RNA sequence: AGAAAUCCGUCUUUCAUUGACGGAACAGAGCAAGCAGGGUGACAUUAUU
DNA sequence: GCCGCTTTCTT
DNA sequence: AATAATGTCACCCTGCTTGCTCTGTTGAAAGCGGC
DNA sequence: ACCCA
């Protein structure tokens, strides 16, 4: 089978005033018709029966809840605009049972008990269906009969069975001549009876073709006429007759197809209310037009069906969450846990939900055992817990809660305490959970065959300026009600460059004239002579480069074979153009010669890729069941040049320290002039010279962008206590920092550090507004107040946020492009990546959550997933569980293999942070990764002959003054490695070195460490290799 | 069928009328968190009397 | 063959 | 025994901000009559 | 576990 993809383009229409009136009026007409279809289909779907759902559900492998599918169509949370029969939440179960003739399911209970937003109210759509029957003047059962026909013909979507596009318009209201269904039904059943009791099953299709022709009394040239009356798209049976007599025959496939045809054409389309419905629609919309009625129907039907499907799934998920909540409801331990706030440790006035992460989670057990281990005197067992449970990611537990839980350890078990906390937060999430309202929405309308084909375009090409217009030929509705086609232009130099410009190449032939699809435009020259308005030069440049290419006979012509292009337009005049293109044949399973890759996402370092190949002989991998060979690894990079100099937009950290003295200087000059104020417990003002903080920032010689982020924090600190008068000089300093020289509005890469810098600058302006307007708990301040006080600076707030948004969008796009070019350059057909990565949650520290919000791991994954099929590259999502620590080609080849990560530190640079990490890893005698870090330190001590230090390391605590200082350990390693510049390998979490069994990273070199031969590899490249060699899917397998 | 238009964006103490470059989009609903001030409440380190 | 309409299609 | 510096953790508030997921859409393929 | 001082 032939796999394809979709690219799209997007711009704004530029009609003249007359055609603009026509277009806006037509769109308003379509929108009014869409609203009418929305209300009417709301009622119609309120009319469905359990039989209709059963018939639409019957052939589905997963069993379906017919009652829930009825409920999500009979009762809908809605906006005021489609609210016709308001029903109180209290009577939902009663009225549902009345309609269903049976007691409500528990999932339906959960659907009805769910919260809905402020502006949505429950609507009884079955009552609306009854009133619609009255409005049409037809009996309820007659409209139900027509509804059965519509759902049977797939004109409407019911449950898991989707609609067939907009065929409802042609089927119910069409003016033309229909199929002869009885002929088809009879022929189909007699061939199925001719083909289900064969005494020999042929391996080719020819005897079957002969049987079908004999059954239909037809030849191969007449079969379409005989079977379908020459009407409609070719059926499965026609295509079967058409194929070469030598193709392999699939009996089960053909029988399945014939069964579908028999099922779908066993009954007539014998309408009862066809003409009433058609008069109703024509009266409440416009006169019959298949396309316009289709557009109205599409908008309304899509809205309703997505909401009802979502509510079905949501109700089932809600029932499961409720069952879980009811299981953990041990109810006396729950109340002891929550009696904390009434106990004598909570000295506060405002309570909060006690969560599992407030209790140290799993590790609570350890605390428990210590209490029964060393009772009566607890407290230091509490702090050993807390101190061993510090992370830069996880929220740390609350002391007073642990203290209080000592008081009830004898009766409430750790099992049940954690169960109670989990119950707490689950219940909280469950009361908050909201059902989904049905709303028409703001989607635009699609004109079919809307774009003038590029070869038929009307070009007013000047020798020094190409015609850059693309014209739509749209049907528009005039005030008298007649339709007429009109020409409307628009500009899109991307669409012009990739598709629309006329190509004149003898041999160049490509899908899209863009670098990632293999085409590079020729460069401009000194004889190019661009002279346009400034706000047009970039677009102009593109035009020029196309002109030159046509001038050289070098511009390729699109090989896409476009016969029609649609255009989607909204009320704002925006136009969207989709282009479907074939990407090639659907790949089979891995064979020898297929190349695959994996990629690793990081936030302070580059993303990494690892490229592998399936081979005939060599390294066997059990999980893959084949021989593999490592090709190469690399950093994911997106480089642009400035007058010869290269910059990686994804990772550039800015100028080195000695390079930005002047900038630094001005900051210094400002900060000498100011102090930082602060309020003492006893309220009193305490000041500090603000320049000490600046010196602390400078001492470690940061690069420009970290320096700007830290200086932004310092400016925010300076702003805090000031008067209105002080805030004005500080304001000139703020503007100068933001806009001149190296401020964020002029300099900054796409790196994570730059995004954090911009957010810190926004923090400065926020603090300025809060200080100026005297914000407090008793005086919340607002945006209107902020704009009233200082519109310029408020506008910067918005501008900085827009800068961040554009940076992140560009960065996701560039990361995906870089990986895709790596794959295309190395003929990689398979990409594999973590669909697992964290976003944010309560149990995580706020700073980690904020960084993850700027990290966009999910966005990068989704972008790779969007781009890869455009080159017939298959992406698989996988779990990231332990992918930073597995030993490539050893792990699960055949058993688990894991090692810690390492850092290369000069012996010189080994401080107390190193000793802290050594001590901490040496007590890391725990499950998970810590095992491997404990091992690590062991090897370290063995490799550097530092066993005698071990005990000093185990007692190293960040408080102790008896701690072994760092210079002992530096002196020992200097003794042994010869000098103070010598690299020492220290086992550290997040280290960039991995000691690998095999050469699994480009540039890795072999060493012997603790008498084991190992490859010193980029740890991120190793993680990418692990991801590449993963085979089991995200959830489990 | 009407000569205009950056389609949307990125980088650089370099801002470019020949600098180097990147991108399927859209709608609604829902979920998750962040920030600035202001408050509460634990702990730790410094020192001291 | 184009344009604009119809219909059926289980790929 | 405290008081106070300075610093790290958590938990609230009002009003603003963004990332991500769900369920979809942007039709396919043939013949007709009038040009 | 991913993410990192
Ligand atoms: Mg990594």
Numbering used by the authors: 0 to 1036
Study text:
In the Cas12i2E833A ternary complex, Mg2+A is seen, but Mg2+B is missing due to the Glu833 mutation. The Mg2+A cation is located in a similar position to Mg2+A in the Cas12i2wt complex. However, unlike the Cas12i2wt Mg2+A, the Cas12i2E833A Mg2+A coordinates an extra water and not the scissile phosphate. Thus, the binding of two Mg2+ ions is essential for the proper conformation of ssDNA substrate.
Two Cas12i (Cas12i1 and Cas12i2) proteins have crRNA-guided dsDNA cleavage activity. The Cas12i2 consists of the recognition (REC) and nuclease (NUC) lobes connected by the wedge (WED) domain. The RuvC domain is the sole DNase catalytic domain in Cas12i2, with catalytic residues Asp599, Glu833, and Asp1019 lining the active pocket.
